Amino acid sequence: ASFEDTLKATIKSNTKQDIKILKIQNLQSSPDVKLVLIAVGNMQVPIFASKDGKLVMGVSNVFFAHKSEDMGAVGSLIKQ
Amino acid sequence: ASFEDTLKATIKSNTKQDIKILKIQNLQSSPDVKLVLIAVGNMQVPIFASKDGKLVMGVSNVFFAHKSEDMGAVGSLIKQTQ
User: Fold this and answer.
1) What DSSP string describes B64-80?
2) Taking every annotated instance into account, which residue ranges of this chain make up the domain Disulfide isomerase DsbG N-terminal (chain B) (predicted)?
């Protein structure tokens, strides 16, 4: 099952909610976690997701990346 | 560089703090992310870490997993810290 289909399933299975995947952004630091922006209800909201889509973790204000630029990336979409 | 060493590096380089790793817990839903509990000074704080230790992401009150048990696992570990 693709990342978007797994990711869609993973959220629905825990929230009963049908989401739209708006924007997927890869992280230069590592391929294990993809920064993704989804539409739930009336808001667009960002999350972190395992590359397989079987885990989502909400964006918090703790985020350190081996590469500096990715911190800009998350900071950009959290302003989005 | 090993997972605990990379994780130590990637945290220190950005908070210039030296931390110990107390507990590492793998998530059954995926191996891509490890739930890890570290010590900053006299605080214990849980975090999520890419399996290679090159991303640390704070535990928030959003976390969804494909396998149900993993939610129990993090929910217990957030209780141990506070």
Assistant:
1) EESSHHHHHHHHHHHHH
2) 7-82
Q: What is the resolution of this structure in A?
A: 3.2
Please report, for chain B, the start and end positions of each structural domain, with discontinuous segments joined by +: 3-81
Which tokens belong to A32? 């294990």
Fold of B3-81: Nuclear Transport Factor 2; Chain: A, (3.10.450)
Nearest CA in chain A to B8: A66
Query: Domain A3-78: which topology?
Result: Nuclear Transport Factor 2; Chain: A, (3.10.450)
Using CB atoms, pick whichever of B15, B33, B61 lies closest to residue A33: B33
Tokens of B24: 């590492």
Interchain CB distance below 8 Å, B61 and A62: no
A-B contacts at Cβ under 8 angstroms? 112
Technique that determined the structure: X-ray
Q: Does B52 touch chain A (CB under 8 A)?
A: yes
